[PDB]
C-alpha cells in the first residue's frame, strides 16, 4: 500500500536503526516505493550506507531529514531524531563534531590476556582502565564512562540510557551494550560512551554490570604496558 510522508519517514529511520545495529528488527514494507515517490531514487542498502557514512563522518555542510547533504528544509548541526516509532535514537552529525570521535574496529586489537581476578568489583573501587564510574548520591544516579568500547559491557536487569558523541538511545535488554556501527572503509564505533543508570527507577533494583576488567600490568614490553583482564561483576542496583 502507499505511505504518506509521516509513515514513510518512520520506516526510513527504521532501516537506518537496523543498519546501525541498534535494532535487530525493522518494518520496511512500502519503503522502496516511498523513496521512489518522495525522493526519486532507489534506496537499496548501498544508498543507506552512504547516508549513514555521510551523516556521521563525511559531512557536506547542511543535512535534511533523510540524511542528504519534500525534505528541502536542510538544517545545520546537532541531531536528527531517528525515530521509527518502534525505537528511536538521538544521533549527531559529524559536522557538529570537532574531530573523529570514532574508532576503527576492523584494525587490529591490542592483545589482552585473561588472568585470575576479583569476581565482584565495587562501584566505588573500579581499578579497570576501561571503566570510570561517577556516583551521584544526590540524584540517586550512576554514570559509567566506558573508555575501551571494544571490551564488552553486559547489562543484567538494567534500564539505562547510552550517551555518546555519535548517538543517544535507551537500552532495556540484557546482554552486551549495543553501539552504533558505521561503515567507512572499515567498521567504526564510538571511541567512548556513557551508561546512565537511574537508581530512582524500580526497574534498576537489581542492575548489574558484567565486563572484563582490563588492567595495566607492571611489565612494559614493546614500549607499552602489557594488558591483562579478568571477568567481574559491578553491582549497581540496591538488591543486586
Amino acid at each position: 500500500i502507499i505511505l504518506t510522508l509521516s509513515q514513510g519517514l518512520k520506516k526510513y529511520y527504521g532501516k537506518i536503526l537496523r543498519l546501525l545495529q541498534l535494532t535487530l528488527e525493522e518494518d520496511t514494507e512500502g519503503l522502496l516505493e516511498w523513496c521512489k515517490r518522495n525522493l526519486g531514487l532507489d534506496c537499496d542498502d548501498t544508498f543507506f550506507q552512504k547516508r549513514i557514512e555521510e551523516f556521521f563522518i563525511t559531512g557536506e555542510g547542511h543535512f535534511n531529514e533523510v540524511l542528504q547533504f519534500p525534505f528541502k528544509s536542510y538544517f545545520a548541526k546537532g541531531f536528527l531524531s531517528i525515530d521509527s516509532g518502534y525505537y528511536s535514537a538521538k544521533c549527531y552529525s559529524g559536522t557538529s563534531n570537532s574531530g573523529l570521535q570514532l574508532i576503527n574496529i576492523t584494525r587490529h586489537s591490542t592483545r589482552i590476556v585473561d588472568t585470575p581476578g576479583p569476581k565482584i568489583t565495587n562501584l566505588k573501587t573500579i581499578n579497570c582502565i576501561n571503566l570510570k564510574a561517577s556516583i551521584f548520591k544526590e540524584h540517586r544516579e550512576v554514570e559509567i564512562n566506558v573508555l575501551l568500547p571494544q571490551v564488552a559491557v553486559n547489562l543484567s536487569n538494567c534500564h539505562v540510557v547510552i550517551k555518546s558523541h555519535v548517538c543517544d538511545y535507551s537500552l532495556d535488554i540484557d546482554g552486551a551494550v549495543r553501539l552504533p556501527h558505521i561503515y567507512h572503509e572499515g567498521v567504526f564505533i564510538p571511541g567512548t560512551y556513557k551508561i546512565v543508570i537511574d537508581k530512582k527507577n524500580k526497574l534498576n533494583d537489581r542492575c548489574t554490570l558484567f565486563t572484563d576488567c582490563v588492567i595495566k600490568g607492571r611489565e612494559v614490553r614493546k614500549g607499552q604496558s602489557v594488558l591483562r583482564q579478568y571477568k567481574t561483576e559491578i553491582r549497581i542496583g540496591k538488591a543486586s
Epitope: 590476556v113 588472568t115 585470575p116 581476578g117 576479583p118 582490563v214 588492567i215 600490568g217 579478568y230 571477568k231
Partner: antibody
Framework: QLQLQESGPGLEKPSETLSLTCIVS??????????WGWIRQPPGKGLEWIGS???????YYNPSLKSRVTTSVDTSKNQFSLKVMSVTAADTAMYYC???????????????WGQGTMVTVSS | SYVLTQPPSVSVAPGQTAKITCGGN??????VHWYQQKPGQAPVLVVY???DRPSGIPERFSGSNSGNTATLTISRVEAGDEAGYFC???????????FGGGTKLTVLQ
C-alpha cells in the same frame, strides 16, 4: 625473602579428610597482587592444580575436585590451608603450595613454591 | 576443560638446541608459563608470559607463543638441563589453572 612451607600429616586414613597447611614467611599473606594455591603430583604423574585462594577469602577451584576440596586463609597466622574430603589411594601425592599473580598487575605464573609435602593414604 | 598437549619426551645432544611444544586451541591468546622440575624437587618457573625469564634463569632459555602452539627453546643444552618441563596457562573460560602433561628432556650421555 618470601618463603613457603607445607605442613602435613604424612599419612591419612581412607575416607578421612586430609588437611595441609602452608606457612608463609618473610612477608605477609595479605598481598593484594597475589593469591595462594595448592598443586599436587601423584607418583609418576604430572602437576595438577587443586585451587587458589585470595587473602580476602575468595576461592578458585579446579572443577574436577571442587566437590570435595576446600581452602581457607588465616591472615593473622600468615598461612593458608587445604582440605580434601574422603580420600582414597588416588590422593597419595606430593602436595605443593605456591604463590601466583592475581588481579592483573603481576603475571599469573606461580613464581614461589614450597618444598612439597608427601601424603600417603593407607589404612 | 581446556586441554594442553605436550610431547612425552625429547632428546638432545649436549650443545644442541632443544624445543618443547605446548599445543592448545588459540593458545596464543593466553599467557603461557614454563616450569622445570628435576627429580624429587619442586617445580621452578623458568619462562613466564610466553617469553620472559625470572631472575637467575640463563639466557639459553627462551619462549614463544602464537596460533595453537607455544614453544620452549633451550639453546646450547647442558647436562643439568635434563628435567621435566611443564607448560601452564590460566583458562579464562573455565576459570582454572591448566598444566600440560609434561615433557621429559634427556641429554645424551
Amino acid at each position: 625473602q618470601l618463603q613457603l612451607q607445607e605442613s602435613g600429616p604424612g599419612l591419612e586414613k581412607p575416607s578421612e579428610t586430609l588437611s595441609l597447611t602452608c606457612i608463609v614467611s618473610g612477608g605477609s599473606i595479605s598481598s593484594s597482587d597475589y593469591f595462594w594455591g595448592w598443586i599436587r603430583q601423584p607418583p609418576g604423574k604430572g602437576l595438577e592444580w587443586i585451587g587458589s585462594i585470595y587473602y580476602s577469602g575468595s576461592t578458585y577451584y579446579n572443577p574436577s575436585l571442587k566437590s570435595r576440596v576446600t581452602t581457607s586463609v588465616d591472615t593473622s597466622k600468615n598461612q593458608f590451608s587445604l582440605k580434601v574430603m574422603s580420600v582414597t589411594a588416588a590422593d597419595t601425592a606430593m602436595y605443593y603450595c605456591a604463590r601466583g599473580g592475581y588481579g592483573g598487575y603481576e603475571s599469573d605464573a606461580y613464581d614461589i613454591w614450597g618444598q612439597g609435602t608427601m601424603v600417603t593414604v593407607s589404612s | 576443560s581446556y586441554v594442553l598437549t605436550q610431547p612425552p619426551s625429547v632428546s638432545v645432544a649436549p650443545g644442541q638446541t632443544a624445543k618443547i611444544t605446548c599445543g592448545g586451541n588459540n593458545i596464543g591468546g593466553k599467557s603461557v608459563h614454563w616450569y622445570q622440575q628435576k627429580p624429587g624437587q619442586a617445580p621452578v618457573l623458568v619462562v613466564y608470559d610466553d617469553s620472559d625469564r625470572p631472575s637467575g634463569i640463563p639466557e639459553r632459555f627462551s619462549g614463544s607463543n602464537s596460533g595453537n602452539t607455544a614453544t620452549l627453546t633451550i639453546s646450547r643444552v647442558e647436562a643439568g638441563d635434563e628435567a621435566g618441563y611443564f607448560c601452564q596457562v590460566w583458562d579464562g573460560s573455565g576459570d582454572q589453572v591448566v598444566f600440560g602433561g609434561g615433557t621429559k628432556l634427556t641429554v645424551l650421555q
